Amino acid sequence: IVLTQTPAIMSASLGERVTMTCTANSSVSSNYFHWYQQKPGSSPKLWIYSTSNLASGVPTRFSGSGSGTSYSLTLSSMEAEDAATYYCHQYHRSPPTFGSGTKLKMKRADAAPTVSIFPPSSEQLTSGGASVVCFLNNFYPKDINVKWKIDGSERQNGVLNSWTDQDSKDSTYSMSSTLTLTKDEYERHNSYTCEATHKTSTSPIVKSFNRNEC
Amino acid sequence: EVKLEESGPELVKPGASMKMSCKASGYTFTSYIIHWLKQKPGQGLEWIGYINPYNDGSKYNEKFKGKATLTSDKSSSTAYMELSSLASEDSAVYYCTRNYGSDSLDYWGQGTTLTVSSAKTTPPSVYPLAPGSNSMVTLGCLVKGYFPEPVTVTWNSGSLSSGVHTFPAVLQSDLYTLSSSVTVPSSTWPSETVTCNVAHPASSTKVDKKIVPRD
Ligand SMILES: *[C@@H]1O[C@H](CO)[C@@H](O)[C@H](O)[C@H]1NC(C)=O
Numbered sequence A: 001i002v003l004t005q006t007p008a009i010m011s012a013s014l015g016e017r018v019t020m021t022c023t024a025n026s027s028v029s030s031n032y033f034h035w036y037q038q039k040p041g042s043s044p045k046l047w048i049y050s051t052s053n054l055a056s057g058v059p060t061r062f063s064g065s066g067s068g069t070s071y072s073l074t075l076s077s078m079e080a081e082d083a084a085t086y087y088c089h090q091y092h093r094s095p096p097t098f099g100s101g102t103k104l105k106m107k108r109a110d111a112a113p114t115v116s117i118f119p120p121s122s123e124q125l126t127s128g129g130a131s132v133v134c135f136l137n138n139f140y141p142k143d144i145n146v147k148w149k150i151d152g153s154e155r156q157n158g159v160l161n162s163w164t165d166q167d168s169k170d171s172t173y174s175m176s177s178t179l180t181l182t183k184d185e186y187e188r189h190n191s192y193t194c195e196a197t198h199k200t201s202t203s204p205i206v207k208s209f210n211r212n213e214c
Numbered sequence B: 001e002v003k004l005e006e007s008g009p010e011l012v013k014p015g016a017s018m019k020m021s022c023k024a025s026g027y028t029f030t031s032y033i034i035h036w037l038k039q040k041p042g043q044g045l046e047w048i049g050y051i052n053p054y055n056d057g058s059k060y061n062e063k064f065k066g067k068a069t070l071t072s073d074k075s076s077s078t079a080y081m082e083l084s085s086l087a088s089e090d091s092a093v094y095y096c097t098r099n100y101g102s103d104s105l106d107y108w109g110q111g112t113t114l115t116v117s118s119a120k121t122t123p124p125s126v127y128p129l130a131p132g133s134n135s136m137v138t139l140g141c142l143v144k145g146y147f148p149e150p151v152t153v154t155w156n157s158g159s160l161s162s163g164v165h166t167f168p169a170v171l172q173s174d175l176y177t178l179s180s181s182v183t184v185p186s187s188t189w190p191s192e193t194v195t196c197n198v199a200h201p202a203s204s205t206k207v208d209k210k211i212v213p214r215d
């Protein structure tokens, strides 16, 4: 039995009411309809059982309702610890099935990235590789563009980017950008610059490392 | 306290099989059904089947009734799942979870990360990230060249609120790159020792890397 969750992704500011829905392709008994919450890197947690009963420890701002094919989870007042993915579950028939999820994010104030650049360690240089790392920490919203410049020319190859999900405390994103070259290629250039474009500044937020200053 | 403890992460070759375990403690093992579920990165949950340790009966998703075999050992209060003839698309986190009232899933194992791949298990190289030659200073560790997932990173530092970020790993050419940043008051470092501690359970290795200032 297919369960379709909507919206797939949504954001709410603190204190706002949030409702998410799960629609089944067939009727399912309300006694065998459940909700789970999952945070990145962790197991799912039973959140609501039999449509409207809160699991042990679940804050009272949550509720659930529904019958037939349409079910909903409502959060009366969005709070920071509520940012997570929520899944519906039917066990009306075997096999039991789960929704594709509603990822609920926290809206917050714009924050500029704090940029930090790091040269290759002497330890990595013995391996025949060289990585330059740029952290772009504690920014909002998630939308950001990172460019690497080597002695003024853009470098696009050998760049690995990764983003955290919203920080538990301040709800910002962070991003890591790693430029990896061969040691030979690394030693043919002087300066390595990571440049961040973000809505909080009309100018890029940049940091550079020069080989001659170190 | 009810606990479901799953076996560690493993790498398995295409065409081989895997067997993973889920050790139950703190309740009557034989009184509750255990379910097994699959979760691919960035997807929802898919149910594989259940084991009833009371009568040794297992029920399967028709999709999985060929591939999966669920068993349990009453002697050790342990449920097991065998997955046979594996391919790349069997790579996922697998959970065991306890069937409760109205077949809600109340207690969950921590997950077992299964990677199916032709590549070799390789331990990480860990490199210190120290500033080149402010009241706050950001340092980090670069965790390169390992396979498979996961690794864990823990810091010994004076990090501030929202001051630790460990980035999800990125795969490239059968090897993962992960990084982690820590932001500490500039009075604490290089004064006090800051260390990133990396574990890679699939290769049974760890690394304790001190962040030394560049000379
Ligand atoms: C279930 O319903 C959704 C939404 O109407 C539809 O797109 C999908 O095709 C349906 N699936 C099946 C297997 O009938």
Ligand SMILES: [K+]
Pocket (backbone or CB within 6 Å): B208, B209, B210
């Ligand atoms: K050490």
